[PDB]
Amino acid sequence: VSAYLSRPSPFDLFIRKSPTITCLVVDLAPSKGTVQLTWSRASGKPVQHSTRKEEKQRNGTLTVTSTLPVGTRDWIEGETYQCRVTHPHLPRALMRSTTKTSGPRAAPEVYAFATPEWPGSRDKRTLACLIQNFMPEDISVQWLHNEVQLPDARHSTTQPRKTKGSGFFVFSRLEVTRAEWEQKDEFICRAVHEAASPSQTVQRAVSVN
Amino acid sequence: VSAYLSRPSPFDLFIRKSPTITCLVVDLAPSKGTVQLTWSRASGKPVQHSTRKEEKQRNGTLTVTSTLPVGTRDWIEGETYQCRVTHPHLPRALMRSTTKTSGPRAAPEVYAFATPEWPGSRDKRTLACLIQNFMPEDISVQWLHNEVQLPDARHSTTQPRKTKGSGFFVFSRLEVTRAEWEQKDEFICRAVHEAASPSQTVQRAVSVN
Numbered sequence A, B: 001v002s003a004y005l006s007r008p009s010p011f012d013l014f015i016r017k018s019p020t021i022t023c024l025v026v027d028l029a030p031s032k033g034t035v036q037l038t039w040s041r042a043s044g045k046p047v048q049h050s051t052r053k054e055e056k057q058r059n060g061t062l063t064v065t066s067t068l069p070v071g072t073r074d075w076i077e078g079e080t081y082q083c084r085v086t087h088p089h090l091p092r093a094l095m096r097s098t099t100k101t102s103g104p105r106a107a108p109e110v111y112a113f114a115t116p117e118w119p120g121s122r123d124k125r126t127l128a129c130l131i132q133n134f135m136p137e138d139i140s141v142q143w144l145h146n147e148v149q150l151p152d153a154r155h156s157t158t159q160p161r162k163t164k165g166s167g168f169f170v171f172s173r174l175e176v177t178r179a180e181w182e183q184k185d186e187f188i189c190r191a192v193h194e195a196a197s198p199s200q201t202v203q204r205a206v207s208v209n
């Protein structure tokens, strides 16, 4: 049995301003309807109501996820949140905690590129975005077309990796359609990161032609 | 304790024609004793001598790997190699096997890009390479300068992620210096892959300019 606790996404924390964290306990093969999941704050102040979601996955094991909304100011000023997991056949209850990452800050460089045409793909292009030299590693990426955000399912972002320096990079990939670039040939890759000043966004336009 | 058996790198398999497979055992509680990694072939034929290697990691974990050279024809013609792990305090002996993945094939698309100058730091640029729409996921990516291959640690390549199509993609980042592009302003990203005819190889250059 293993447990994971995430931090809020920069997007939710800075753009939507409704940050949440998620406690994920995995690999709970056997059943005894009572995998207790308890939230609290390191300061002792009260936590909000959380949602619960337990799903049998077809690898023989059970997954349970609980999401807790947190205060925007509370998280930025450095509160630490904690998820204690009590299982029925537990030896000891398992504790996980989360807080904003410490260390130096550094704004991401953003660069946006369009691929050329490949044989057998006249009506689509791939756009890629390189976002690099940021710290800490938490970052969201959003793509915009017609001054609106495209659904997130439409792009994929790689996991943060260390650069040869002390900063991190991710790449983001987004396939687009002729209908889109012809209607408006400008796509914006926008990084959301706390060190980006002000407004926590740095962004870059690219066009297909 | 968790064990992993990797397939040979395409580079080693198709270009150098000396493929190897690696049994990776990660032991998170280093007990006294000797972990045993023992190799065999499903056919029962002889296996070559292997290299064993151990290192206590910074976070207390023991890491044992064993690397076994394999025949090129044997691998290509679908031989199955098996790694048997024996821990001192093992309940059961762990087993892992690996074999050629034989689903559908599709060549990779390669696209190479160079960032413009970031204000201030002009003694460096970042080169990126997108390799996409390939299957299966097995791929070797390398960078070249003066028709000569640079050291692996110079680049960072992401893990095969699924495209929206059926294929996989990977990004690769290489920072270069101004000394390098002034010596010769041409860097090649080369992808080695099972399905990249005519020579298992496709590559694309890019210039800093």
Ligand SMILES: *[C@@H]1O[C@H](CO)[C@@H](O[C@@H]2O[C@H](CO)[C@@H](O[C@@H]3O[C@H](CO[C@H]4O[C@H](CO)[C@@H](O)[C@H](O)[C@@H]4O)[C@@H](O)[C@H](O[C@H]4O[C@H](CO)[C@@H](O)[C@H](O)[C@@H]4O)[C@@H]3O)[C@H](O)[C@H]2NC(C)=O)[C@H](O)[C@H]1NC(C)=O
Residues within 6 Å of the ligand: A002, A004, A006, A024, A026, A027, A057, A058, A059, A060, A061, A063
């Ligand atoms: C039985 O089958 C189940 C699912 O059916 C498998 O469950 C998965 O198990 C893995 C590994 O335990 C889980 O992966 C973990 O995800 C964590 C974060 O969530 C991910 O997904 C959310 C999307 O909502 C993203 O926000 C986030 O970025 C992640 O993509 C990670 O934090 C964990 O990573 C940590 O440990 C890994 C090592 O595993 C490090 O490399 C990481 O850097 C980090 O330290 C981890 O990746 C996965 O979430 C589970 N799936 C689901 C659907 O919940 C069982 O593993 C499987 N059991 C067996 C034995 O095969």
